[PDB]
Design a protein around this ligand. Structure first.
Ligand SMILES: CCCCCCCC/C=C\CCCCCCCC(=O)OC[C@H](COP(=O)(O)OCCN)OC(=O)CCCCCCC/C=C\CCCCCCCC
Ligand SMILES: CCCCCCCC/C=C\CCCCCCCC(=O)OC[C@H](COP(=O)(O)OCCN)OC(=O)CCCCCCC/C=C\CCCCCCCC
Ligand code: HEC
Ligand code: HEM
Ligand code: HEM
Ligand code: HEM
Ligand SMILES: CO/C=C(/C(=O)OC)c1ccccc1COc1nc2ccc(C)cc2nc1C(F)(F)F
Ligand SMILES: CCCCCCCCO[C@@H]1O[C@H](CO)[C@@H](O)[C@H](O)[C@H]1O
Ligand SMILES: CCCCCCCCO[C@@H]1O[C@H](CO)[C@@H](O)[C@H](O)[C@H]1O
Ligand SMILES: CCCCCCCCO[C@@H]1O[C@H](CO)[C@@H](O)[C@H](O)[C@H]1O
Lengths: 59, 67, 79, 241, 379, 49, 101, 55, 54
């Protein structure tokens, strides 16, 4: 029963609730960003510099 | 030698019933205008209708054959 | 301070439940939507009418304006 | 006059709300600009460093910039002087000022192309349709000497002679330099020059939408949850009657 | 005082206007615009300051400084986007705020209403000067055309004009004084907004039925704080969507071309939010009469409170007034449309009609239908 | 008299777990709150981002 | 005419306040005359009016209305306040006219 | 960060004009708060004793 | 005024030299800042001496 466990550990004391919002944001950012860029780039395969970059890199 | 996919598709499009009908209208205007000294009329409107239909058609197709 | 001087009220009872005992969005199909329609229905004929009457005016004038750009072949017959 | 022809809507690879710019097409468009338009058209707001990480290498970009002589100064004696270009320099101007520009184009003034696609109704569709739309005037229409017929240009008599024709140059990546291909590439390039943020702007728009959806949702629940106390509330009138 | 929210001279204020403030239990979403307007305002100011910090008020640098801001400043393009589009959002919100008030007879709160009108005028002047700053073709000719109307005021005509321009034509001196005004006015807006809310709080909010809500008031928080925050995100999504996905949707491309005094643009027209007024302006051919018609098109708002004849406050229970109201709204889309169209038939006559109908509906029909409606209730 | 007064039926609105007039509503308390507080905590995280 | 009397009942239904259970008089904007008129209402009429209004406001907040059965019917709408309001206005006009005199 | 560069230069100047144009209004703002707190108690006076008997 | 390193110094000079009463307005502003401080320092002093800080 996560809702129960979460409520007792995370949402009960305002102190832990805020602490939860922080780590929640830290993790969420890292994840939301990667996923977002991954979606964006995949939707634009081979059009970005990132892609065609190999063609001109090699001294 | 290389060919401009535009000219190709331009030709293929001029076939359209839309173009043909428009194209015909023009040749008619051009003819009566060219054969009359001292007048106003200009086959702009007609030219435009043709160009509008031809070019409309070209748009869907043209980019398919461009890198 | 405006709470307490507001109005003279008598014999009215009200009952309510903590939000943690009820449903945030309850009866979506049996109650919600039906009313959404009820409401939509009752207004459409007051609102829509003039907006539509405008769409027309708009559509006419937009075209009537373009029509005046096309030429009248009856100016190049007599020449 | 008073009649105008509107360009069609070409399906650019960067037309989608989430579709970026094809950087290969932008790289080519640069060459077209560098080797053809730049002889008459200035692009004051773009610098060689702007190419880096977008269409060129840092090494490539530095080279491109050294192919140009820039006037610096003053020096000790208060003299101006030439020097090779740096990536911090902007694309070179063809003429010193508009007066000189017109003088070299029959009184015509080729506009700066930095914001051209946003400065003309039609954007790349208009620029593309114009570049590839040169033709002969219909019956009854005479174009004054020095001017050329183009239905897409207002007034139809443009002071620019058809700038591009098949194989007028060649791409070092080996792409068939047909006229329409060229115009297509320079137009893609012109979009970038007018708004380098294009891609980032759409990548953000995406993140904005997801977060917007997620948040509008959650807040709708919360609002409903609080108001539930009132929405379900019942009342009665009980006079001592 | 037990709780430091009632006694503290400052927390008592935040409290007595956003936390314990008695609000009608049934105000709809049309009551969400006041807060949006507020938030919008703080937002415009913040993005404006950020831009002002990279701007240069000089005819030889204005256009380019903005270009420099978009191209070189970290997120400069974004801040620029949000500011110009924010001005739109501001107006969309303000127009609905007004409509709401007209429909639900809020204007009966006269001082709250009259200050609202002043806010509108200030906001319009603000956007007017701000528009000149990027110094593009529409910025210059918009400035030139509109400010030139004042010379149509007999006697002190050319005077006020050449005084306002600081010269013989819209030039640098005009630019620098416009930057100052654009930087200033927003603070006056914030100022007056405070007064607006003060008068409002005397009476408290009106509500959709137009009947005393004293029997059912509720604490602004959490009810309306949550309702208002939601109303924010709802609006914000389209604002941002249009901003980030179609940046140049609303803007005129003629402004991507540096102002030029020797080249009048083919079609000089304002941003969407001024169109309706532009239409009424030209509807009357005669420089002075057109100015007066424009003036009244907005100043008419000061008259609404006096043309209320109904015995009921809102239009919720007045079907005749309702349609007349929606006719008026549609009358405005028409004027808007006409404003964006060149001065040629059929537009010219459609325009004069829409203008004529606009004043007729407000000065004649509305007060009349209200009287008629009272008799249909046997009053 | 007040004795003739009773609280109406809130079945149409009750959450499931507290729908049965004979079951301790305390057992599902931490559940009903953990959910609503989770929604809130999430809105916070989204807003923080 | 007994015609416009058909109009009345039409309008009455078009208005729609009866759907909230409000009486015609319950919808009057509370200007000064109305304010005074209400102060003269008998306790019972006053409390009945109060509940009707608090009831409508609750409906309005809920975005609901009364079941068709409960709607006030045109011929059963009690114009309870009009008699008093009519008087408050008579008195006022008297004073007004007398003070110019 | 404050300079907007490596030395006091144009970017610093333009942001200083903006701040100079801004701060005065904040001063006016806070001045209002100043007088509000003051009015709670009322003015003090040279002898430092309650002036309630003679306002 | 013109907030730019190439025009700031001159824009102020232009204001004093060309603007109707620009010199006077400039004088009052710079000297007003002084008056402002003279006043503020006495304001503070008074407050310290008469214990207004309470
Ligand atoms: C690296 C990333 C990290 C950065 C984030 C750090 C920020 C963390 C700060 C701490 C988090 C705040 C905690 C608040 C605690 C107070 C509290 O009680 O909860 C909030 C409290 C509710 O309390 P209860 O539900 O009753 O729960 C009681 C617990 N038993 O109030 C709330 O509802 C607040 C949360 C709602 C957020 C609303 C904000 C809406 C705003 C809209 C956005 C602009 C254009 C964009 C341009 C595009 C680039
Ligand atoms: C001025 C410039 C004009 C530019 C264009 C502005 C944008 C125009 C878009 C039109 C707005 C579309 C909104 C449709 C709303 C549909 C709707 O719900 O209408 C019916 C609904 C029924 O409510 P009740 O009668 O109280 O019944 C309660 C029972 N549940 O009516 C309402 O919501 C009230 C109307 C308020 C919204 C008014 C918005 C119109 C805005 C236009 C500006 C007008 C003011 C004049 C400005 C002069 C300067
Ligand atoms: C100098 C000989 C030119 C070369 C090489 C190119 N252009 Fe040009 N362009 C030139 C002139 C003299 C003009 C002025 C036209 C007028 O009568 O005003 C132009 C104009 C343009 C325009 C559009 C102008 C408008 O719409 O008002 C564009 C968009 C344009 N030129 C594009 C363009 C491109 C992409 C070129 C390289 C492929 C190019 N021009 C070369 C002269 C010359
Ligand atoms: C700077 C712009 C404005 C701001 C910041 C603003 C703000 C507010 C706020 C926050 C409210 C309370 C909540 C609401 O009802 O929306 C309000 C109410 C009101 N405002 Fe404005 N307003 C602005 C412009 C105007 C304008 C232009 C008018 C009308 C000419 C106006 C008329 C009113 C009225 C009459 C109310 C009463 C609402 C009611 O019926 O309860 N306001 N305004
Ligand atoms: C009521 C709030 C405000 C409104 C309605 C508003 C509106 C506008 C408008 C319409 C423009 C032109 C946008 C464009 O098309 O480019 C503009 C530009 C500008 N505004 Fe504001 N503004 C507001 C507040 C401010 C404030 C407070 C400042 C200064 C601290 C400011 C600084 C600027 C600057 C620097 C520009 C020029 C750069 C640009 O064009 O983006 N604005 N503003
Ligand atoms: C923007 C600058 C300021 C303004 C506009 C201002 C204004 C005022 C005004 C009008 C008064 C009432 C009349 C008087 O006693 O002079 C006052 C009183 C006072 N101000 Fe200021 N003040 C300013 C700055 C300060 C400063 C810097 C201090 C001290 C750090 C201060 C401390 C006080 C105190 C303590 C009083 C109480 C006077 C008393 O009755 O003994 N003020 N101020
Ligand atoms: C500096 O000029 C700025 C314009 C603008 O659109 O501002 C956002 C603009 C551009 C082109 C043509 C006209 C305008 C300004 O128009 C107006 N600007 C107005 C500004 C304030 C007030 C009270 C009324 C105004 N009316 C008008 C009207 F549209 F009616 F002409
Ligand atoms: C979308 O790409 C962005 O381009 C920016 C370049 O201005 C980088 O600073 C960002 O980190 C990157 O995500
Ligand atoms: C309604 C509130 C929406 C907020 C959306 C936040 C998304 C902005 O995210 C931005 O995306 C850019 C492109 O990847 C990055 O370069 C920036 O660093 C990042 O902050
Ligand atoms: O304006 C409002 O006026 C009210 C009346 O004084 C105050 O209580 C509020 O704090 C203030 O914001």
């Amino acid at each position: 029963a996560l809702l129960r466990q979460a409520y007792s550990a995370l949402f009960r004391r305002t102190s832990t609730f805020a602490l939860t919002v922080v780590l929640g944001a830290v993790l969420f950012e890292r994840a939301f960003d990667q996923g977002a860029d991954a979606i964006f780039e995949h939707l634009n395969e081979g059009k970005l510099w990132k892609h065609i970059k190999h063609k001109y890199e090699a001294s | 030698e290389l060919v401009d996919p535009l000219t190709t598709i331009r030709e293929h499009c001029e076939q359209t019933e839309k173009c043909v009908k428009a194209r015909e209208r023009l040749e008619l205007c051009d003819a009566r205008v060219s054969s009359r000294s001292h007048t106003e009329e200009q086959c702009t409107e007609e030219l435009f209708d043709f160009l509008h239909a031809r070019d409309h058609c070209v748009a869907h197709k043209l980019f398919n054959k461009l890198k | 301070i405006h709470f307490g001087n507001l109005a003279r009220v008598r014999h009215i009872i009200t009952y309510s439940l903590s939000p943690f005992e009820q449903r945030a969005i309850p009866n979506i199909f049996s109650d919600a939507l039906p009313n959404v329609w009820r409401r939509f229905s009752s207004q459409v004929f007051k609102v829509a009418p003039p907006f539509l009457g405008a769409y027309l005016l708009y559509s006419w004038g937009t075209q009537e304006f373009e029509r005046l750009k096309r030429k009248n072949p009856a100016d190049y017959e007599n020449d | 006059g008073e009649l105008e022809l509107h360009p069609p809507a070409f399906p650019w690879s960067h037309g989608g709300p989430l579709s970026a710019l094809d950087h290969s097409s932008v790289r080519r468009g640069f060459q077209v600009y560098k080797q053809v338009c730049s002889a008459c058209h200035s692009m004051d707001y773009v610098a060689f460093r702007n190419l880096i990480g977008v269409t060129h290498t840092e090494a490539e970009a530095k080279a491109l910039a050294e192919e140009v002589e820039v006037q610096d100064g003053p020096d000790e004696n208060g003299e101006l002087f030439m020097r090779p270009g740096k990536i911090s320099d902007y694309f070179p101007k063809p003429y010193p000022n508009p007066e000189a520009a017109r003088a070299a184009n029959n009184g015509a003034l080729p506009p700066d192309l930095s914001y051209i696609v946003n400065a003309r109704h039609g954007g790349e569709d208009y620029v593309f349709s114009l570049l590839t739309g040169y033709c002969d005037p219909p019956a009854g229409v005479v174009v004054r000497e020095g001017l050329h017929y183009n239905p897409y240009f207002p007034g139809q008599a443009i002071g620019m002679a058809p700038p591009i024709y098949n194989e007028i140059l060649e791409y070092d990546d080996g792409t068939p330099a047909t006229m329409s291909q060229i115009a297509k590439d320079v137009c893609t390039f012109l979009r970038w020059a007018a708004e380098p943020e294009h891609d980032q702007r759409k990548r953000m728009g995406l993140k904005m939408l997801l977060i917007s959806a997620l948040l509008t949702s959650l807040l709708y629940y919360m609002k409903r949850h609080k108001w539930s106390v009132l929405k379900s509330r019942k009342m009665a009138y009980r006079p001592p009657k | 005082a037990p709780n430091i929210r009632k006694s503290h001279p400052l927390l008592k204020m935040i409290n007595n206007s956003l936390i314990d403030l008695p609000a009608p239990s049934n105000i709809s979403a049309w009551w969400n615009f006041g807060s949006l307007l507020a938030v919008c305002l703080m937002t415009q100011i913040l993005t404006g300051l950020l831009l002002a910090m990279h701007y240069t008020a000089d005819t030889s640098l204005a256009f380019s400084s903005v270009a420099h801001t978009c191209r070189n400043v970290q997120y400069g393009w974004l801040i620029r986007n949000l500011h110009a589009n924010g001005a739109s959002f501001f107006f969309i919100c303000i127009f609905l705020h007004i409509g709401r008030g007209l429909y639900y007879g809020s204007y009966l709160y006269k001082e709250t209403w009259n200050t609202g009108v002043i806010l509108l005028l200030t906001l319009m002047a603000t956007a007017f000067v701000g528009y000149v700053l990027p110094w593009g073709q529409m910025s210059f000719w918009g400035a030139t055309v509109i400010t030139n109307l004042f010379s149509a005021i007999p006697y002190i005509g050319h005077t006020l004009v050449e005084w306002a321009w600081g010269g013989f034509s819209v030039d640098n001196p005009t630019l620098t004084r416009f930057f100052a005004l654009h930087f200033l006015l927003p603070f006056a807006i914030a100022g007056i907004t405070i007064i607006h809310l003060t008068f409002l709080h005397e009476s408290g909010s009106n509500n959709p039925l137009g009947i005393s809500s004293d029997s059912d008031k509720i604490p602004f928080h959490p009810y309306y704080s949550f309702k208002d925050i939601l109303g924010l995100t709802l609006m914000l999504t389209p604002f941002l969507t249009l901003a980030l996905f179609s940046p140049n949707l609303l803007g005129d491309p003629e402004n991507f071309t540096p102002a030029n005094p020797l080249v009048t643009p083919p079609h000089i027209k304002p941003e969407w939010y001024f169109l309706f007024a532009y239409a009424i302006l030209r509807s009357i051919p005669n420089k002075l009469g057109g100015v007066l018609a424009l003036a009244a098109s907005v100043l008419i708002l000061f008259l609404i409170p006096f043309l209320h004849k109904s015995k009921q406050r809102t239009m919720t229970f007045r079907p005749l007034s309702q349609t007349l109201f929606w006719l008026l709204v549609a009358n405005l889309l028409i004027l808007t449309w006409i404003g964006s169209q060149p001065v040629e038939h059929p537009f010219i006559i459609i325009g004069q009609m829409a203008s004529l109908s606009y004043f007729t509906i407000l000065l004649i029909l509305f007060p009349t239908i209200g009287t008629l409606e009272n008799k249909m209730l046997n009053y | 008299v007040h004795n003739d007064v009773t609280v109406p039926d809130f079945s149409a609105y009750r959450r499931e777990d507290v729908m049965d007039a004979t079951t301790s509503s305390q057992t599902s308390s931490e559940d009903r709150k953990g959910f609503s507080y989770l929604v809130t905590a999430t809105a916070c995280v989204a807003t923080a981002y | 005419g007994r015609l416009m009397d058909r109009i009345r009942k039409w309008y009455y239904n078009a208005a729609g306040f009866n759907k909230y259970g409000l009486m015609r008089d319950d919808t009057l904007y509370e200007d000064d005359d109305v304010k005074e008129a209400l102060k003269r209402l008998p306790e019972d009429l006053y409390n009945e009016r109060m509940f009707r209004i608090k009831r409508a406001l609750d409906l309005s907040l809920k975005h609901r209305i009364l079941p068709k059965e409960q709607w006030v019917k045109y011929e059963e709408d009690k114009p309870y306040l009009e008699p008093y309001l009519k008087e408050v206005i008579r008195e006022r006009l008297e004073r007004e006219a007398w003070n110019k005199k």
